[PDB]
Amino acid sequence: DQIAELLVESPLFSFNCAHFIAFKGFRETLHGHNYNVSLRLRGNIQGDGYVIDFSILKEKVRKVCKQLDHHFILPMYSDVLNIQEVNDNFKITCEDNSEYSFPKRDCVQIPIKHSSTEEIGLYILNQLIEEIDLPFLKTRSVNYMEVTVSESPSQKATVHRNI
Amino acid sequence: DQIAELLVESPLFSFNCAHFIAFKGFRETLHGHNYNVSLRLRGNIQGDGYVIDFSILKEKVRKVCKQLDHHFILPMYSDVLNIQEVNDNFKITCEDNSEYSFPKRDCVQIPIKHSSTEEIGLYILNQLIEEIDLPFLKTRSVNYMEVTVSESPSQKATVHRNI
Amino acid sequence: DQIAELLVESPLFSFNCAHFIAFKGFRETLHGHNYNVSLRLRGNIQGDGYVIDFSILKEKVRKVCKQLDHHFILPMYSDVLNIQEVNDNFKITCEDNSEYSFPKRDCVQIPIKHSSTEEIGLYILNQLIEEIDLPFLKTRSVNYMEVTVSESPSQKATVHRNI
Amino acid sequence: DQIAELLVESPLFSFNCAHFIAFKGFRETLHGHNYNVSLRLRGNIQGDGYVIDFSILKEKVRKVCKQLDHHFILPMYSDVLNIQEVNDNFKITCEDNSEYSFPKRDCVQIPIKHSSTEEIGLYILNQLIEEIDLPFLKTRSVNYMEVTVSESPSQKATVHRNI
Amino acid sequence: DQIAELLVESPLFSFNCAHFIAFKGFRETLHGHNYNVSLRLRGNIQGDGYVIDFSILKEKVRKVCKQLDHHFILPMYSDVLNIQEVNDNFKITCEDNSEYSFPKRDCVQIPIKHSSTEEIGLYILNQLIEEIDLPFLKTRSVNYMEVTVSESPSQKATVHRNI
Amino acid sequence: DQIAELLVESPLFSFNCAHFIAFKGFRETLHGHNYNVSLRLRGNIQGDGYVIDFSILKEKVRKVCKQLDHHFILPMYSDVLNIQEVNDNFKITCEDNSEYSFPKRDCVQIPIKHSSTEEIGLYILNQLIEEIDLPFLKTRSVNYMEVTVSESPSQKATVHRNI
Ligand SMILES: Nc1nc(=O)c2[nH]c(=O)cnc2[nH]1
Ligand SMILES: Nc1nc(=O)c2[nH]c(=O)cnc2[nH]1
Ligand SMILES: Nc1nc(=O)c2[nH]c(=O)cnc2[nH]1
Ligand SMILES: Nc1nc(=O)c2[nH]c(=O)cnc2[nH]1
Ligand SMILES: Nc1nc(=O)c2[nH]c(=O)cnc2[nH]1
Ligand SMILES: Nc1nc(=O)c2[nH]c(=O)cnc2[nH]1
Ligand SMILES: [Zn+2]
Ligand SMILES: [Zn+2]
Ligand SMILES: [Zn+2]
Ligand SMILES: [Zn+2]
Ligand SMILES: [Zn+2]
Ligand SMILES: [Zn+2]
C-alpha cells in the first residue's frame, strides 16, 4: 500500500466576512477579511488511482465556505459578549459597553467562543468531515484530515483530526 | 530625458475592513475584505538616479492604508442609506428598512456614495496625492499617478490622474 | 465623469486543454496546459457605483472558459493540417505525415489557424464580447475590452478591442 | 548534529503534458496541464554548510521534468485501456470503445496504471532518487525524500520515501 | 485541549543582504538575495482564543529580520576565511587568495561557519526564541518552533526546535 | 492586421546581485537582491501565428540576466564614487570616505551612474534589444519593447522604447 497526501487550495475556497475579536480585557474594532481555507488529507492510493477524488473535496470545501461567506461571524459562545435578539436583529454589547446591531440574516451564528483563526479552523474542520462524510472517508482509507484557515495570507492557523 | 514608471505593491498596503454595497434597488449583507492598494506613477529619472524614492511612496501608501484599516467603511454620501448619530454610534437604515448600528469609532467616514472598489480607489488616489504632496511630485517630474484597489485579488479597479 | 479600469483574474478562469502548434515548416508534439484568462475593461463609473458589476464579468469569463476546458483545441482553419472526419473521430494528418486521431467529442473546433496563445486570445475576446453583449457593454459606458491568455504563467498574450 | 529540511520549488520544474484519467466505469476527455513538481528532503547539515547542494537537486528535478514535458502521458499498466502499436503510433481503445491514436514519439510510456497525480508523483519520486543516486544521498545523510506534483496549483499530491 | 499550528509569512519578513558561500575547496563570487523568513509553531489554543497572538510573532520576526537587513552577512566562524580588522573595515582573505574589504558597519557578524541558508536559519531560529522569550512561549503552551529561510523563493531551508 | 502584446515573466529571469545606491549626499550600506526582469512587447500576429516566438524571448532574457547574476553591480559612471584598480581588485571610495574592495571578477561593470532599479532597467532594455537584434524584431513587426526590473517584488521600475 502506498500513502499519499492530497492538498486542495484555491483563492476560491474563500469566505469574505466581517468579525471582531473579543476576550477578557480586549475588544477590537469591527473589520473583515477574505478568509481562505485549504484542506490536506492522507490515505492510501486506491485501485482507481486516487486517494479520494479531488472534485469531491473541492465541492465540499466550496459548500462550507459558501455558508460563511458574505456575513458577520457571530461567536455564539463568547463569555465577553452579550448577544441579544431585538426584533430581526442581533444586538451585541461588549465588556466596555460598546454596542453593535446587525440584521440576523447578515450574521452566521457559529458555535465558537472567539472569532479567531484557530477556532474558525476547528469549526471548519468539523463541518468538512461532516459534509464529506466520515464513513465515506473511511471507505477511501483516509486517516487524517487537516484544515488551514487564514484571515490574511500572512497569518494562518492549521488544525487536524486523526480519523 | 528618460521616462520610467514605478510600481509599488505589497500585501502590506492593506486595509482589512467591513462594508456593504447599497445602491437603488440593491443592498447586500455586511461582510469584509482584505483590501489591497498598489501605486503606479510616471516621471523622468532625476539626477540622483530615481524618478522618486520608493521609500517615500511606500511610507505614504502605508499611512493612507492605516487610516482605513480595521474599520467599517461608511459611505457618507450614499443616497440610499439613512445615517443617524445615536449616542456614540452610527445607525444606518436601508431602503429595505434593514438597520445596523456601530460605534462611531469603529467606522471610517469616507466622502463617497458607495463602498465600491472604484469609488474607494478614487478616494485613495486623492488622499495619496495629498499625502505625498502635489508640489513635491512636480519637483520630481511626476506627471501621472495611478491607484489599483482590490477587494480580493480576483477583482481590481484602477483609477488615475494626470498631474 | 470618472474613468475606471476593471480587472478580473483568477486561477478559476482556466481551461485545461491539449494542443500542438503547427505552421509552415514546424510541428510540435502533443501536450497541454492549464490556460488562464484575465479580462480588463475601461468605462465611466455609473450612478450605481460600478463601471459594470464584477459578478457579471466573472460569470461570463467562467462560461467561455468552461466551453474550452477539458478538450483538445482543434484549429479548424490551419493551412498545414489535414483534418478528416472518420466515424466519430477527427483524424489529423500533418505536413511531416504524422497522424493523430481523437474522438470528436474530445475536441473543441475553434475558428483559428494556429492554437497559439495570440490566436486563442483573439477568439476568447470575441466570444466574451458576445457573451457579455455589446449593447449591454455600451449601456454601461464600456469603451475598451482586453483579454490576456497564458499557456503557462511565464508567457502571456494580450489582445484588445475599442468598442 | 543539526537536521534541516530543504525544499526546492519553481515554475521551472514543470512538464506540460496531455493526459486523461481512465479507471473502471470512468473515462474522461483528452486534455492537459502544466504539471509542477517540488522536492523536499531531510538530513543533517554537513561540514560544508549544506545538507546537500540545492544546485544538484535543481539539476536532477529539471532533468526528470524534461523527460515528461511536451508529451502525452501514456499509462502503460492500465487495466481499462487497450494500447496497440500501429505503424509508428499508439492506438488506445477505451472501455466505452472510444479510440485515440498518437505518434509514439509524442507519448511518454510511464509504468503506472492511471495518469493520476498520485501515481505520477510516485513515479517521479522513484526517478528522482535514481537520478540523484541513493548512495550519494546517503553520503550526505539524507534520510527522507518527498515529491509534490500538481496538475494545477489548486490540487496537489505528495508522496515520500524514508531512505 | 486542542492543538493548533500557526504560520506567519510575509514578503515583509525579509533581509536584503550580500553574501558568498565558502567552504573547503569552494568559493563563490560576491552577490546577494532578498532573504525571506517564515515562522511556524504549535501549541494548545488558550482561553483567549489564540495559541499566541500573531501580532507578537510578527513584531519579533520583523525585529530579527531588520537586524540583518541591508548588510553583508559575515560568517565569523568560517574555517576557510581569514577575517582581519583593518582600520574601520573587515578585510576577508580567501583560500584562493581573493581579497575583500568592507566597512565594519556594512557587515553583520553572525556566529555561523558558512552563510548557507541552513546555518542562517539555525541562527534565526535561536534569535527568535530569545526575542519572543522562551518562558513566555511556555506560558502560552508552545512546544514547537520552526523557521524557514529562503535565499530565493525556489530554495528554502527549514529548521526546528522542540521546546 | 491584429496587434498582440506578449509578456514573458519568470522567477528564472533573475540576477542575484550585490549593490549599493550612492548619489550626492547619500550612500547606503552594501546589500543585495534577487532582481527580476520581465519583458513586454507589441507587434502584429504574423502568418505563423506568433508575434515573435516566446522561446527566443526567454532565451535572450535569460542570457542577459545570466551576465549580471552572482556579482556586485558596479556603476562605472558614478559621479560620487572613486573607482580604483588595485592589483586584481576594484577599490571604491565614497564621498564619506568609506572604502570597499572586491575582486574585479566578482564585479560587473555596467555603464550606469547609479545602481538604481530605473537605470538597471534602461541598461537591460538596451542589452535585450541588441541580443534579440533590432532588425530581427522589425522583421516580426515588433514596434514596442518594455522591461520591468524589480529589486524586490514590492518595488519595480518599467522602461520602454518605441522601435
Ligand atoms: N493567534 C491569533 N489568531 C488570530 O485569529 C488573531 N487575530 C488577530 O487579529 C490578531 N492576532 C491573532 N492571533
Ligand atoms: N464593479 C464592481 N465593483 C465592486 O466593488 C463590486 N463589488 C461587489 O461586491 C460586486 N460587484 C462589484 N462590481
Ligand atoms: N508567441 C508565441 N505564442 C505561443 O503560443 C507560443 N507557444 C509555444 O509553444 C512557443 N512559442 C510561442 N510563441
Ligand atoms: N485524487 C485525485 N487525483 C487526480 O489526479 C485527479 N484528477 C482529476 O482530474 C480529478 N480528480 C482527481 N483526484
Ligand atoms: N543546501 C544549500 N544551501 C545553500 O544555502 C546553497 N546556496 C547556494 O548558493 C547553492 N547551493 C546551496 N545549497
Ligand atoms: N526610485 C527608487 N529606485 C530604487 O532603485 C530605489 N532603491 C532603494 O533602495 C530605495 N529607493 C529607491 N527608489
Ligand atoms: Zn481580524
Ligand atoms: Zn464586498
Ligand atoms: Zn503549448
Ligand atoms: Zn487532468
Ligand atoms: Zn547566494
Ligand atoms: Zn538595494
Side-chain angles (χ1 to χ4, degrees), chain D residues 6 49-57 140, chain E residues 19 21 26 28 31 33 35 115-120 151 155 157, chain F residues 70:
Chain D
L6 299 186
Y50 299 159
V51 178
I52 179 171
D53 189 346
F54 285 129
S55 301
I56 299 171
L57 306 186
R140 296 299 307 191
Chain E
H19 90 127
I21 296 298
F26 179 76
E28 72 186 341
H31 64 285
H33 301 294
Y35 288 90
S115 58
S116 64
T117 310
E118 292 93 319
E119 289 184 46
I120 292 167
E151 269 182 351
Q155 48 186 64
Chain F
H70 258 246

Side-chain angles (χ1 to χ4, degrees), chain A residues 19 21 28 31 33 115-118 151 155, chain B residues 70, chain E residues 6 49-55:
Chain A
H19 90 127
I21 296 298
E28 72 186 341
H31 64 285
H33 301 294
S115 58
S116 64
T117 310
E118 292 93 319
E151 269 182 351
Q155 48 186 64
Chain B
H70 258 246
Chain E
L6 299 186
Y50 299 159
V51 178
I52 179 171
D53 189 346
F54 285 129
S55 301

Side-chain angles (χ1 to χ4, degrees), chain F residues 27-107:
Chain F
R27 200 261 305 167
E28 72 186 341
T29 53
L30 180 68
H31 64 285
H33 301 294
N34 302 319
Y35 288 90
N36 188 259
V37 172
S38 67
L39 169 69
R40 179 172 326 236
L41 58 75
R42 299 168 187 153
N44 299 324
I45 303 166
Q46 301 299 294
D48 60 13
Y50 299 159
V51 178
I52 179 171
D53 189 346
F54 285 129
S55 301
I56 299 171
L57 306 186
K58 289 184 158 173
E59 177 183 318
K60 300 306 180 188
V61 174
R62 292 181 338 248
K63 181 176 188 196
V64 173
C65 289
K66 179 70 176 165
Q67 296 165 355
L68 299 161
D69 183 52
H70 258 246
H71 296 94
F72 175 83
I73 297 169
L74 185 55
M76 73 201 269
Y77 299 150
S78 179
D79 59 339
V80 297
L81 303 174
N82 183 314
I83 301 173
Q84 184 180 344
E85 296 183 293
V86 178
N87 297 323
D88 301 317
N89 278 39
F90 289 119
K91 173 181 177 180
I92 303 176
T93 305
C94 300
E95 294 190 303
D96 66 3
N97 279 105
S98 291
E99 290 183 8
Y100 299 80
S101 183
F102 312 128
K104 291 174 185 179
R105 65 176 301 270
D106 283 45
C107 302

Side-chain angles (χ1 to χ4, degrees), chain A residues 26-42:
Chain A
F26 179 76
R27 200 261 305 167
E28 72 186 341
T29 53
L30 180 68
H31 64 285
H33 301 294
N34 302 319
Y35 288 90
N36 188 259
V37 172
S38 67
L39 169 69
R40 179 172 326 236
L41 58 75
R42 299 168 187 153

Side-chain angles (χ1 to χ4, degrees), chain E residues 13-26:
Chain E
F13 304 167
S14 59
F15 46 105
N16 299 351
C17 290
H19 90 127
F20 63 89
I21 296 298
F23 54 84
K24 287 290 181 188
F26 179 76

Side-chain angles (χ1 to χ4, degrees), chain D residues 19 28 31 33 151:
Chain D
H19 90 127
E28 72 186 341
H31 64 285
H33 301 294
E151 269 182 351

Side-chain angles (χ1 to χ4, degrees), chain A residues 39-59:
Chain A
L39 169 69
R40 179 172 326 236
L41 58 75
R42 299 168 187 153
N44 299 324
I45 303 166
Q46 301 299 294
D48 60 13
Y50 299 159
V51 178
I52 179 171
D53 189 346
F54 285 129
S55 301
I56 299 171
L57 306 186
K58 289 184 158 173
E59 177 183 318

